[PDB]
Amino acid sequence: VLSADDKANIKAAWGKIGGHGAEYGAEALERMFCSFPTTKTYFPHFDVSPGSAQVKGHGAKVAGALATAASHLDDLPAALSALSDLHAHKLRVDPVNFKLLSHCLLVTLAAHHPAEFTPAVHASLDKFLASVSTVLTSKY
Amino acid sequence: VLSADDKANIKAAWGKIGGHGAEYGAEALERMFCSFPTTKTYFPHFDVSPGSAQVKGHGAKVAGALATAASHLDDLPAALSALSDLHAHKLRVDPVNFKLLSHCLLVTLAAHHPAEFTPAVHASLDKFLASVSTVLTSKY
Amino acid sequence: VHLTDAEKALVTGLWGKVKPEEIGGEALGRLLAVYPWTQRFFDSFGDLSSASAIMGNAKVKGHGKKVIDSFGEGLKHLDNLKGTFASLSELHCDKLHVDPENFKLLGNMIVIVMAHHLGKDFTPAAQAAYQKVVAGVATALAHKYH
Amino acid sequence: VHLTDAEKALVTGLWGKVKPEEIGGEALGRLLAVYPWTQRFFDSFGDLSSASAIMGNAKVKGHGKKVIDSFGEGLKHLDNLKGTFASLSELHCDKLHVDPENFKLLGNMIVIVMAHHLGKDFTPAAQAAYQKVVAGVATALAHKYH
Ligand code: HEM
Ligand code: HEM
Ligand code: HEM
Ligand code: HEM
């Protein structure tokens, strides 16, 4: 689980994202499909070509869920329950691909905010992404 | 985390363990050291030869904490924070080894309690030991 | 990849004391209940919603005999463990997209089920050997993941 | 994995626009920071108590420099990752007892450090090219893992 400084770093790091989160989510997904193309198989109904309108509007969705998670760090299971139904119960996403998207999202963050992506902030966000991943891949 | 069903199966399963805990905790360690010999490098001062006084007495300690975890499921980070410090801060155990040890515990319960080791109970216990692992491996 | 013939005699001597068909049925069923995201790969199999349903699912048992029989063949060529499974790694990687970490999970179920059936006779030595078998089979099913 | 010339040109092209000692020093440091249990393998290195101490550790900088030298040596032999990482694989296996899963953590840190240094020049296509390389290095580092 997270520490006080994790929570502080996650919240601090999330503030600096601002309105870029919608785009950082879209880039994270595109990096996940480009590097790990077997994750395309979770989105057969999507146009998953880069620049696709569908991945754009979905990166905004994933973003909004991460900022929600960032402001409810004590109890992720409660605030992501409806999202845990989706990814676990009906979609049944292999936990490995959350690691994949988490890595691509941190690649995105390193690629856009170099002065802010310190080793300490990085470690906290990795743990942040590990906590949300555990919540969503749970309870089938 | 766990579900009410998982919490019900954990207390019930551990309840059916009884005074066998300390024995299972030692056999589990003995299974880990034999199947996964690198795990022995974490106990360089122990006897760790089959049958041992120290490994047997250590298996009890492992069995005692699990009993504590089994009755504090809604607050593992609190009741395991002393053990987290030892394994995460002090020893720095590689998470892969908590999965090896978890696996040997389930082999032990499968080997000793056929009738009680149902697939449902097995599933709840794997989430039990995995939650405990996360706490014991996390810094916080 | 290479067992001592003590370990090799331990696996073949305890395999003869189990019925492979229920080893496969229980192992595959226990994977599906313990690691339920594995069910995504099994949508034509019908009802996988609960532990009892997986254990009563007739095609899961039928598929465990396929899994366990190919596993049985692996037990006949522990030295060329790579070539016997090359068609299967081919099939799990490129046509089903099973993540290779899940091959370890099924092998763990085979180990847990062997302990279930055999009780005391599934000693740590017995497990140590069978761990080597499932470890090598799992890595074999992963040889074509590029 | 085998790489098209377009990917080799992409990997070697972007490699010539970073300084490897910075990558190595930053990747190993971030590994020890992001994944704290890897510190256990570095007790002769002294203080690794904080992210501050880790990135200031002079031995860390020194070792990241040697790690990146071997990685760089892999970049010149991508079609021979087995043979080029034979010596380091057996060292990590039989002596250091480094779990093979951690090879991919360090590989991932190399990817993320390239994105840090390169910004938007580390394209999604650039990432996929480097992802193939570190996964090959991680594989090669761990098949002589008997
Ligand atoms: C940090 C991790 C993740 C978060 C926060 C997240 C969040 C979300 C959100 C907000 C939605 C839309 C819910 C709605 O408004 O109806 C969604 C849907 C979805 N997610 Fe994720 N997700 C994550 C990881 C993943 C991963 C790793 C995959 C697959 C590799 C995935 C696959 C999907 C799919 C297929 C949908 C359905 C979209 C559709 O049907 O149009 N998610 N997720
Ligand atoms: C859920 C799994 C585990 C539990 C519940 C557990 C529990 C414990 C407990 C209760 C102690 C004694 C603490 C004390 O004396 O106050 C201990 C010590 C220790 N544990 Fe574990 N442990 C687990 C997994 C592991 C693993 C995977 C390893 C290494 C491979 C490990 C290595 C050690 C070592 C080296 C000690 C110190 C022994 C001594 O100095 O007496 N533990 N653990
Ligand atoms: C030691 C591990 C494994 C062995 C020996 C094994 C063996 C086999 C065999 C022999 C088949 C026969 C193909 C057929 O006739 O349909 C098969 C199919 C299949 N396997 Fe496995 N497998 C293993 C692991 C896994 C895992 C981990 C998964 C998913 C989590 C999986 C999912 C499937 C699926 C979906 C099929 C196709 C079923 C169908 O369409 O009839 N397998 N496997
Ligand atoms: C991309 C992955 C890796 C590469 C390319 C790599 C490469 C190297 C190199 C070049 C050396 C120096 C050997 C010598 O000079 O004789 C080394 C040693 C070492 N490696 Fe790594 N390594 C990797 C991953 C890891 C990981 C994941 C760990 C632990 C978590 C680790 C721990 C060590 C240690 C402890 C040493 C010896 C340093 C000492 O004893 O003071 N390495 N490795």
Author numbering:
A (entry chain A), B (entry chain C): 1 to 140
C (entry chain D), D (entry chain B): 1 to 146
Original authors' sentences:
Hemoglobin is a heterotetrameric protein consisting of two α subunits and two β subunits, and each subunit has an iron-centered heme that reversibly binds oxygen. Hemoglobin transports heme-bound oxygen from the lungs to all of the tissues in the body via oxygenation-linked shifts in the conformational equilibrium between the tense state (T state; deoxygenated) and the relaxed state (R state; oxygenated). Populations of deer mice that are native to high-altitudes in the Rocky Mountains have evolved a genetically based increase in hemoglobin-oxygen affinity relative to lowland conspecifics in the prairie grassland. The most common hemoglobin variants of high- and low-altitude deer mice are distinguished by a total of 12 amino acid substitutions–eight in the in the α subunit and four in the β subunit.
We solved the crystal structure of the highland hemoglobin variant to gain further structural insights into the molecular mechanism responsible for the evolved increase in oxygen-binding affinity. The type S highland hemoglobin crystal contained 2 tetramers in the asymmetric unit that were connected by intersubunit hydrogen bonds between subunits C, D, E and F. Although the UV-visible spectrum of the dissolved crystal solution indicated the presence of carboxyhemoglobin, we were only able to assign a water molecule at each heme based on the obtained electron density map. In addition, chain H (β subunit), did not have an assigned ligand, as there was no electron density supporting the presence of a molecule of carbon monoxide, oxygen, or water. A comparative analysis of the highland and lowland deer mouse hemoglobin variants revealed that main chain displacements were present between α41 and α54, the loop region near heme, which resulted from a α50His→Pro mutation in the highland variant. The analyses revealed that αPro50 in the highland hemoglobin variant promoted a stable interaction between αHis45 and heme that was not seen in the αHis50 lowland variant. In addition, the highland hemoglobin variant had a reduced intersubunit contact surface, particularly at the α1β2/α2β1 switch region. Our structural analysis revealed that the highland hemoglobin variant lacked this interaction, and also showed that the α1Cys34 side chain was pointed toward the subunit interface, allowing the interaction with the β1Pro124 main chain oxygen atom.
